């Protein structure tokens, strides 16, 4: 329980860069390099399924609170 501000602010604080134009919602494949963000790489079978997750070709969008639901 004592962790958690420090880890959540942090993704909050990957999210403002990955946002530049801050409209609260970004791509999917952006997540991925959010991942990196944490020290640990993907590799390569978990974040194929995330590509998918967008159910179409077209941008899919994803929110802050959507994305982390994601990374868990
Ligand atoms: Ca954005």
């Known amino acids: 329980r004592e ?3 420090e880890e959540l602010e ?3 604080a990957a999210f403002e860069e990955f946002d530049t134009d ?3 919602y970004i791509g999917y494949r952006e ?3 959010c ?3 944490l020290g640990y790489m993907p590799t390569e079978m978990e ?3 995330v590509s998918q997750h967008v159910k179409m070709r077209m941008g899919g969008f994803v929110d ?3 994305f982390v639901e994601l990374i868990s």
Do not use: C, K, V
Request: aromatic share 4%.
């Open 3 to 5: 962790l958690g501000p």
């Open 10 to 12: 942090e993704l909050q």
């Open 64 to 66: 802050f609170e959507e």
């Open 35 to 37: 991942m990196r963000t």
């Open 22 to 24: 801050q409209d609260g």
């Open 47 to 49: 974040l194929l399924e």
């Open 31 to 33: 997540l991925g390099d």
